[PDB]
């Protein structure tokens, strides 16, 4: 009932089956079997007018609810283009698919309005974007556009309002050899399914989560709200390590670095006002995107759990 | 970022029922004379319309000072106006050798008896449209906020239902607006949102929003920003975007969907990812050097993206080196390094290149580039890009 309630769903893993909206465009195709060739269970997927037929060797159903009726999928991978995709993640939500995960670029905010409203006064469908990566469990599911191959399953949970700089983070802990237990992209845009907080949530209450990188940028204040979360829960007695790296220091005011809620405006915004509030929440802010995989490696050897 | 004229964006208003002054626009101290007179005002306003702000203080080529005048005599404008169009105006924020004037607006004159502040914008914070507003409007909202925030008031507008006679009446109350006035703007704030919706503004400022001494609720002047993203659905309002008062590059850069934004610095980046080209910007100023730029190939890179880039920061004279910085993104990076030596070839570019890419294949492309006989440096990682594209350029 409540969409915090869905938040669960955000933790996919070798049981979750998958479905992809926009399964025979381009995008939906590569993506497809790339997810095929890491092992995801990519079941069938939907394209309007166009069921009845296999790709990829998989079932092609003209709407959502059919093909979760007849695939038992669990997730949503949406690659529609922008026109059509506010639709294609409310055909997603009346199907109650328990995790959509809409990678399109270039949604309309007023159409993310829309679909945000509906989504908040429902409880069983958990949307991660738009203009996200995807989510991954190294090793066990891969839904999105990250490359495969730099992660190692491991202890590190990641979450990111970037696409390629999510990279960096995942890189930087295989190869110190932490690993990482689930990273989550949230995507760029203002208006979004899924906010640090929720992740933060999965982070705090997961075993197999140890420390947390949690990476943001100029815009918004959803880098402000997951400080105040973190204040709340993890100040003690529960603690796990945090290490941030927020994007945008040198970014000039009024103008849009590339996402669409990357931009500093009203004054509202800027890096080091979120670097502030995250410090003052228990977080150390790595000054360098570099260094994220040392700087959690540090705060893992300071508390002894190497 | 869509750049509407003055006249472009009063018109988009009017067309919808705002109210505004009544204007023509004119290409010529002709039109200009006749539109004068068929305004039948008392007072009219002739107004060069450029982007730049101060046109008031401004001085035409003509040698005419004021980009902005006011007279009663329809005349005037027409005498005036033959002094503008053509010319250059120079402002306190033009290029020095001010801007050519190919339009002038010719609009009534109207008084200001009450300055208010109305806003509409999609508001992240608040999931969705939020009127704001103030009394105490002509002033940058910014300061009103800081100074006296308990005259800032917000209305949150569902945006299923849209906005409630109530909540616009409200709003016009607590702007002061009073007895019938009070209805008028109530209703104004309801064609206003119902424009911002029709155009896919992300905010639809109007500053001053106010009355005429003879009761009548305006719109004086205003400044729409657009949803880049709405852009299929909204053609013909991006296709009066002006960009001849545009940085040449960033003109440039968006022939190819490549989101430049030009810095101050010498040093040349560009990166596949907003996010990562974000904090490449921040790690070469960490390390001391100064970005020439942001640039973002946006995450998939495509070889065509890598070579329109560096015909791009070709243009730029302050480059001093280039930082590539490539991780993820579809395609394998020996053909990305084959698109940079073949770049640099054919463009003829000499400056040092710092080289970081990660991905699929880099072992061949770390060949391709080692045996490329070009000034390439590959570097280790981030930190070891920002720290050899510093050291490469002048103090």
């Given at each position: 009932?409540?969409?915090?309630?869905?938040?669960?769903?955000?933790?996919?893993?070798?049981?979750?089956?998958?479905?992809?909206?926009?399964?025979?465009?381009?995008?939906?195709?590569?993506?497809?079997?790339?997810?095929?060739?890491?092992?995801?269970?990519?079941?069938?997927?939907?394209?309007?007018?166009?069921?009845?037929?296999?790709?990829?060797?998989?079932?092609?159903?003209?709407?959502?609810?059919?093909?979760?009726?007849?695939?038992?999928?669990?997730?949503?991978?949406?690659?529609?283009?922008?026109?059509?995709?506010?639709?294609?993640?409310?055909?997603?939500?009346?199907?109650?698919?328990?995790?959509?995960?809409?990678?399109?670029?270039?949604?309309?905010?007023?159409?993310?309005?829309?679909?945000?409203?509906?989504?908040?006064?429902?409880?069983?469908?958990?949307?991660?974007?738009?203009?996200?990566?995807?989510?991954?469990?190294?090793?066990?599911?891969?839904?999105?556009?990250?490359?495969?191959?730099?992660?190692?399953?491991?202890?590190?949970?990641?979450?990111?309002?970037?696409?390629?700089?999510?990279?960096?983070?995942?890189?930087?802990?295989?190869?110190?050899?932490?690993?990482?237990?689930?990273?989550?992209?949230?995507?760029?845009?203002?208006?979004?399914?899924?906010?640090?907080?929720?992740?933060?949530?999965?982070?705090?209450?997961?075993?197999?989560?140890?420390?947390?990188?949690?990476?943001?940028?100029?815009?918004?204040?959803?880098?402000?709200?997951?400080?105040?979360?973190?204040?709340?829960?993890?100040?003690?007695?529960?603690?796990?390590?945090?290490?941030?790296?927020?994007?945008?220091?040198?970014?000039?005011?009024?103008?849009?670095?590339?996402?669409?809620?990357?931009?500093?405006a009203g004054?509202?915004?800027?890096?080091?006002?979120?670097?502030?509030?995250?410090?003052?929440?228990?977080?150390?802010?790595?000054?360098?995107?570099?260094?994220?995989?040392?700087?959690?490696?540090?705060?893992?050897?300071?508390?002894?759990?190497? | 970022?869509?750049?509407?004229?003055?006249?472009?964006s009063?018109?988009?208003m009017?067309?919808?029922?705002?109210?505004?002054?009544?204007?023509?626009?004119?290409?010529?101290?002709?039109?200009?004379?006749?539109?004068?007179?068929?305004?039948?005002?008392?007072?009219?306003?002739?107004?060069?319309?450029?982007?730049?702000?101060?046109?008031?203080?401004?001085?035409?080529?003509?040698?005419?000072?004021?980009?902005?005048?006011?007279?009663?005599?329809?005349?005037?404008?027409?005498?005036?106006?033959?002094?503008?169009?053509?010319?250059?105006?120079?402002?306190?924020?033009?290029?020095?050798?001010?801007?050519?004037?190919?339009?002038?607006?010719?609009?009534?004159?109207?008084?200001?008896?009450?300055?208010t502040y109305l806003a509409i914008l999609?508001?992240?914070?608040?999931?969705?449209?939020v009127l704001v507003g103030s009394?105490?409007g002509?002033?940058d909202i910014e300061?009103?906020?800081?100074?006296?925030?308990?005259?800032?008031?917000?209305?949150?507008?569902?945006?299923?239902?849209?906005?409630?006679?109530?909540?616009?009446?409200?709003?016009?109350?607590?702007?002061?607006?009073?007895?019938?006035?009070?209805?008028?703007?109530?209703?104004?704030?309801?064609?206003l949102?119902?424009l911002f919706?029709?155009?896919?503004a992300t905010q639809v400022e109007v500053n001053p929003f106010?009355?005429?001494?003879?009761?009548?609720?305006?719109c004086f002047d205003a400044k729409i920003n657009?949803?880049?993203?709405?852009?299929?659905?909204?053609?013909?309002?991006?296709?009066?975007?002006?960009?001849?008062?545009?940085?040449?590059?960033?003109?440039?850069?968006?022939?190819?969907?490549?989101?430049?934004?030009?810095?101050?610095?010498?040093?040349?980046?560009?990166?596949?990812?907003?996010?990562?080209?974000?904090?490449?910007?921040?790690?070469?100023?960490?390390?001391?050097?100064?970005?020439?730029?942001?640039?973002?190939?946006?995450?998939?890179?495509?070889?065509?993206?890598?070579?329109?880039?560096?015909?791009?920061?070709?243009?730029?004279?302050?480059?001093?080196?280039?930082?590539?910085?490539?991780?993820?993104?579809?395609?394998?990076?020996?053909?990305?390094?084959?698109?940079?030596?073949?770049?640099?070839?054919?463009?003829?570019?000499?400056?040092?290149?710092?080289?970081?890419?990660?991905?699929?294949?880099?072992?061949?492309?770390?060949?391709?580039?080692?045996?490329?006989?070009?000034?390439?440096?590959?570097?280790?990682?981030?930190?070891?890009?920002?720290?050899?594209?510093?050291?490469?350029?002048?103090?």
């Amino acid at each position: 009932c409540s969409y915090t309630a869905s938040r669960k769903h955000l933790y996919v893993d070798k049981n979750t089956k998958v479905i992809c909206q926009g399964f025979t465009g381009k995008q939906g195709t590569f993506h497809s079997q790339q997810a095929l060739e890491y092992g995801t269970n990519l079941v069938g997927g939907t394209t309007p007018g166009k069921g009845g037929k296999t790709h990829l060797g998989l079932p092609v159903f003209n709407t959502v609810k059919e093909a979760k009726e007849q695939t038992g999928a669990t997730a949503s991978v949406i690659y529609v283009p922008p026109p059509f995709a506010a639709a294609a993640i409310n055909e997603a939500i009346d199907a109650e698919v328990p995790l959509v995960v809409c990678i399109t670029e270039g949604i309309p905010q007023q159409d993310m309005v829309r679909v945000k409203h509906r989504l908040l006064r429902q409880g069983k469908t958990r949307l991660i974007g738009p203009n996200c990566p995807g989510v991954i469990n190294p090793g066990e599911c891969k839904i999105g556009i990250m490359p495969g191959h730099i992660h190692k399953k491991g202890r590190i949970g990641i979450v990111s309002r970037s696409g390629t700089l999510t990279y960096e983070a995942v890189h930087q802990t295989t190869q110190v050899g932490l690993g990482q237990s689930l990273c989550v992209g949230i995507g760029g845009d203002p208006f979004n399914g899924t906010d640090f907080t929720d992740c933060l949530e999965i982070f705090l209450n997961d075993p197999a989560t140890e420390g947390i990188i949690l990476i943001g940028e100029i815009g918004g204040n959803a880098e402000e709200n997951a400080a105040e979360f973190l204040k709340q829960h993890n100040s003690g007695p529960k603690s796990k390590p945090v290490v941030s790296f927020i994007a945008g220091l040198t970014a000039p005011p009024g103008r849009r670095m590339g996402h669409a809620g990357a931009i500093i405006a009203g004054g509202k915004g800027g890096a080091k006002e979120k670097i502030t509030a995250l410090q003052s929440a228990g977080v150390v802010v790595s000054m360098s995107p570099a260094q994220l995989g040392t700087t959690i490696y540090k705060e893992f050897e300071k508390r002894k759990m190497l | 970022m869509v750049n509407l004229q003055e006249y472009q964006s009063k018109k988009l208003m009017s067309d919808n029922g705002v109210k505004v002054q009544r204007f023509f626009v004119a290409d010529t101290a002709n039109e200009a004379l006749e539109a004068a007179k068929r305004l039948n005002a008392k007072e009219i306003v002739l107004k060069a319309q450029i982007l730049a702000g101060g046109r008031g203080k401004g001085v035409f080529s003509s040698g005419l000072k004021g980009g902005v005048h006011l007279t009663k005599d329809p005349e005037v404008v027409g005498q005036l106006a033959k002094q503008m169009i053509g010319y250059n105006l120079a402002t306190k924020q033009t290029p020095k050798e001010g801007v050519k004037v190919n339009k002038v607006m010719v609009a009534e004159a109207l008084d200001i008896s009450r300055e208010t502040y109305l806003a509409i914008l999609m508001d992240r914070s608040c999931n969705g449209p939020v009127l704001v507003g103030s009394p105490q409007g002509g002033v940058d909202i910014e300061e009103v906020a800081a100074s006296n925030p308990e005259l800032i008031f917000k209305e949150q507008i569902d945006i299923i239902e849209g906005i409630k006679d109530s909540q616009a009446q409200r709003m016009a109350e607590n702007l002061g607006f009073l007895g019938p006035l009070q209805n008028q703007a109530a209703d104004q704030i309801k064609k206003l949102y119902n424009l911002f919706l029709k155009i896919d503004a992300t905010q639809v400022e109007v500053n001053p929003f106010g009355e005429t001494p003879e009761g009548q609720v305006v719109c004086f002047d205003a400044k729409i920003n657009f949803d880049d993203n709405a852009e299929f659905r909204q053609k013909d309002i991006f296709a009066m975007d002006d960009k001849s008062e545009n940085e040449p590059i960033e003109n440039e850069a968006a022939k190819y969907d490549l989101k430049y934004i030009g810095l101050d610095g010498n040093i040349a980046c560009f990166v596949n990812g907003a996010g990562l080209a974000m904090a490449t910007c921040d790690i070469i100023f960490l390390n001391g050097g100064k970005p020439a730029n942001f640039l973002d190939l946006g995450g998939g890179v495509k070889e065509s993206q890598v070579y329109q880039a560096f015909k791009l920061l070709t243009a730029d004279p302050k480059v001093e080196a280039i930082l590539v910085n490539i991780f993820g993104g579809i395609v394998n990076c020996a053909i990305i390094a084959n698109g940079i030596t073949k770049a640099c070839r054919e463009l003829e570019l000499k400056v040092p290149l710092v080289v970081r890419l990660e991905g699929t294949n880099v072992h061949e492309a770390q060949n391709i580039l080692t045996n490329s006989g070009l000034p390439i440096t590959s570097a280790v990682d981030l930190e070891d890009a920002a720290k050899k594209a510093v050291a490469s350029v002048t103090k």
